[PDB]
Amino acid sequence: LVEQLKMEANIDRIKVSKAAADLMAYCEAHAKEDPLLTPVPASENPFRE
Amino acid sequence: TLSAEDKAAVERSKMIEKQLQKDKQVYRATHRLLLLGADNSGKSTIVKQMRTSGIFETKFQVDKVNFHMFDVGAQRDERRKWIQCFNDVTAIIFVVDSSDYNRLQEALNDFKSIWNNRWLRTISVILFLNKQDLLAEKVLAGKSKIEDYFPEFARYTTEDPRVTRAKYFIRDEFLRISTASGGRHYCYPHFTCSVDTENARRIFNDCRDIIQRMHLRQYELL
Amino acid sequence: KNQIRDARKACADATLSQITNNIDPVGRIQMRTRRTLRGHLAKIYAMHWGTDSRLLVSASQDGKLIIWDSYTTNKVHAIPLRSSWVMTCAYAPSGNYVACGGLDNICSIYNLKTRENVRVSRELAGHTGYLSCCRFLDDNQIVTSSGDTTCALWDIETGQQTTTFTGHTGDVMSLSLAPDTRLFVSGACDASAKLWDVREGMCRQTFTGHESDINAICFFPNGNAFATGSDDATCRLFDLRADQELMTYSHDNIICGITSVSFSKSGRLLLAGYDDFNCNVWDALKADRAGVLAGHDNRVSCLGVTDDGMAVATGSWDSFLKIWN
Amino acid sequence: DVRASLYSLMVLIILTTLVGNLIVIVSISHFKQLHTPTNWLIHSMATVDFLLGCLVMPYSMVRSAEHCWYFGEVFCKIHTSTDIMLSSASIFHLSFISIDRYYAVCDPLRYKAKMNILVICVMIFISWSVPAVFAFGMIFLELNFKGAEEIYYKHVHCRGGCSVFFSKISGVLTFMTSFYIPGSIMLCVYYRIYLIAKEQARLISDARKAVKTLGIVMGVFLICWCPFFICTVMDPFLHYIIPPTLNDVLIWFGYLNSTFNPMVYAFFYPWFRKAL
Amino acid sequence: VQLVESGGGLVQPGGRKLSCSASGFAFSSFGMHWVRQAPEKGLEWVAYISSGSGTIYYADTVKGRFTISRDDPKNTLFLQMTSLRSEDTAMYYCVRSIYYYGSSPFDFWGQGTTLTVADIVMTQATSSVPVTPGESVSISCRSSKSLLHSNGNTYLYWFLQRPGQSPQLLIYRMSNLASGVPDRFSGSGSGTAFTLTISRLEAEDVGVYYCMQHLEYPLTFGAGTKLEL
Ligand SMILES: NCCc1ccc(Br)cc1
């Protein structure tokens, strides 16, 4: 119990701003090929009317 | 679908659908029951007489009516999560050992938790009270004061009259919780000996009453 | 104990909302159901897409696994389970196996590719409580979380627990595997999430501050973040490096809890199924509810986003799946 | 003045019929939660009532207000057959709803097994077929007019338009077919269900909704049809002394029942109200 | 798995029933085929019966002459022959098949029994390729029309029949190896031209190579190339 808490406490951590920037960068980079985020043309998907 | 392989895949899917239709026909014509209780109770004896695993399923048929009975085996004390799986069962058979005199309060607390469960509303509970014969010799032989555990036993009125008084005291103590709350589900107390063959018959009768009342409420005739 | 909380508070330089306040929010994302997968008898408790993004296996409380052809709606496989109550199902990354588990303390592994039908390849036993989630690492090992507050890495060829993960006080409800498949997360009813190293077999990080019991968990596609959903009608997004929560997805209108959480391919869309008969789509960077997937007649119980991200499948308690696109 | 008021009342009745039936039909058709076997019978009854309204009520109002029929015999025979067919179909649907409730609250453990899609489909097929065959065979083959050519000719002069004339034996036969057996089945089934519900309520109180519900259902079914069918049965044996107004009025009792049927079989039940 | 056939022999013209008993797989879940192979010709699709007998397809040459049936409880397949002609003197093979997404039809073939008395056309231009062990071998084939359907799948199957025994499936849809075939066979094509290549060459690879189209059920096999050593 105490050993697990001690092990978890002694870990490397970064600022929340860096993590937010990393998530923003990944989302912006991969938004070009996201069919849900960017609606794919109706002739370019296997689920069409 | 236009292709030959796709046509054969479609016909395989249609055979799967036919099998599923037959399974649905079997599934509608059966009643699911949840058996709950405790280690000290006689749920194992009940399921044996009628007919690290985490569940045991029992089939029993009465009057050409099929009854699944699921008894959870090795599970933790907390049950607030998997009980959500049993919000569509016909009834919950709650089994209580009446001769313990010590775990009786634990049984009462468990029944209160089950009765007032959010997911178990509109689900009726059938109370089986085992060890009635054991309760009989315990009451007649003395040496175990019922009023000591429950102070209200002395100020209560309805084989030996004392055995019947104790049995109906336990029954009233169980039914006060059911009558405290609920109009959507009902409690069906019973007295069961160590080995009785009428358990399936009374389960059938209680299930018939439960479904009849549910149908009457659905059409607003109650 | 307090030192970790103090360090986490100190590391919080700024909220992610302030950083993402100036970005352009996505518009009202309208998704329509393109296919309805029907045939299940009882309520559907789990589903899992294939890596081919076409096949998906779904588990019903009636005791049935169904492997569909989501493109053509055909039913590829119908596996009858030995136990009626199943609460989880997984589809192998190679597609050769499917797993399920439920009220019985058994993980059933079925081999789809047989010279024979579909036969149970393995029956993993050793868990004390009910299985709530199972996920394949590969064809030989699988991580299963159960109701006895423990997770377990198994060896399917041997059938014995290669590693056990303990530390949760409440029973574990769901788990998700990182894209690198070297470590995973597990959310329990202890109102906390725990990060487990598969190779080390020990807890690495613990995330708290989520009020009610966590019902679902998933990784951000980058693998350095994960979103949890619980029964208090809120979703959290924790970052592995910051060891804290980034944003909170909740609304004053929403009262009932989340049953399933999934991410989009790029991570810009967080899809959360709710007990209120439908699913909500959130902008994962601004916590704005952009899109609602309504059409289910009962509580949503399972979500899934394909690997290519073209479609999202939703299964609920009305025994129907819907493929939104 | 009187004609305008009668036309307005008939138009209001037609509008109410068509509306209520349309909402009921679209509610069972669209919603997947109301696709239970017991609800398809209600949907089919609503379809019967909607068809009766659209295909009969405007023309009946025209022939009852203007007191004449514009079309010829070809359309008159079709209208009479459609009127009889749809009235009998609605009554049969009511009887099958009664039987379904009987199996629901008197054999509860085997309700879903006995009353499934196959059985309700058989009931709907019977309700749509037996009235259809009966009406078409009785009207187009001059079965009712047989043996009463002089009476038919006399009624033609008195009623310049179309009348549902019935003979002595054919009238009794159709009264039995369309109002006795369905009516007796409904009455006996509902009496048994009332007894069961009263016993259950007494048992629950020891440890009323049924009266109001069954009274409403039986009254709606009776005050409409029983006068009309009683007059139709007794009129050939009463030497045809029934005034024309009682017959047009009576013809209006039936349509009022078709109006009320969705309100009493689908709008009286809170589950449908919440769904709609 | 095993599919063993019984029947056949010498019959006068104008006259048997062939049986195919299965042992080792769920016979009811698999569609069945009867495929001919004349001594002077290649393979020839004869009949097909679905898993549930819902759809049955027949050769264009013989439609009312042969009848097909199955019994799942006995796990047996029957082909009753009526009005046998001179041309109906070929080897008969009972071929297992199954059709779902990702399946491998025509995967297992029976040993067969001797018997003595608008559709698309596919021709393999070469009759026999002389090669040497250890060298890549290429076998080409053509189809009368674009064999790629709108689904993106090209329904072409490559079988190898080693001399002295029954054929065994090598390739299905040009991009999928069979279950136990060595990882040295591969296929490619563009809709009309089709090519199977072997990077290495072993002694067991000798035999006859056949190509079949499954776009339409009247099945057009190929001439077959004899891979001489
Ligand atoms: N709208 C009632 C029409 C009717 C006429 C005759 C009979 Br017998 C039954 C119904």
mmCIF file with all atom_site columns, C-alpha atoms in Angstrom, chain D residues 124 138 150 155 176 210 229 247:
data_model
loop_
_atom_site.group_PDB
_atom_site.id
_atom_site.type_symbol
_atom_site.label_atom_id
_atom_site.label_alt_id
_atom_site.label_comp_id
_atom_site.label_asym_id
_atom_site.label_entity_id
_atom_site.label_seq_id
_atom_site.pdbx_PDB_ins_code
_atom_site.Cartn_x
_atom_site.Cartn_y
_atom_site.Cartn_z
_atom_site.occupancy
_atom_site.B_iso_or_equiv
_atom_site.pdbx_formal_charge
_atom_site.auth_seq_id
_atom_site.auth_comp_id
_atom_site.auth_asym_id
_atom_site.auth_atom_id
_atom_site.pdbx_PDB_model_num
ATOM 1 C CA . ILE D 1 124 ? -55.963 -9.968  -38.639 1.00 0.00 ? 124 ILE D CA 1
ATOM 2 C CA . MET D 1 138 ? -74.281 -11.319 -49.509 1.00 0.00 ? 138 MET D CA 1
ATOM 3 C CA . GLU D 1 150 ? -91.648 -6.482  -53.516 1.00 0.00 ? 150 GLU D CA 1
ATOM 4 C CA . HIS D 1 155 ? -88.107 0.569   -50.141 1.00 0.00 ? 155 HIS D CA 1
ATOM 5 C CA . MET D 1 176 ? -75.483 -13.273 -35.484 1.00 0.00 ? 176 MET D CA 1
ATOM 6 C CA . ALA D 1 210 ? -61.233 -2.150  -13.772 1.00 0.00 ? 210 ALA D CA 1
ATOM 7 C CA . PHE D 1 229 ? -78.115 -4.108  -34.919 1.00 0.00 ? 229 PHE D CA 1
ATOM 8 C CA . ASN D 1 247 ? -81.940 4.325   -39.700 1.00 0.00 ? 247 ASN D CA 1
#
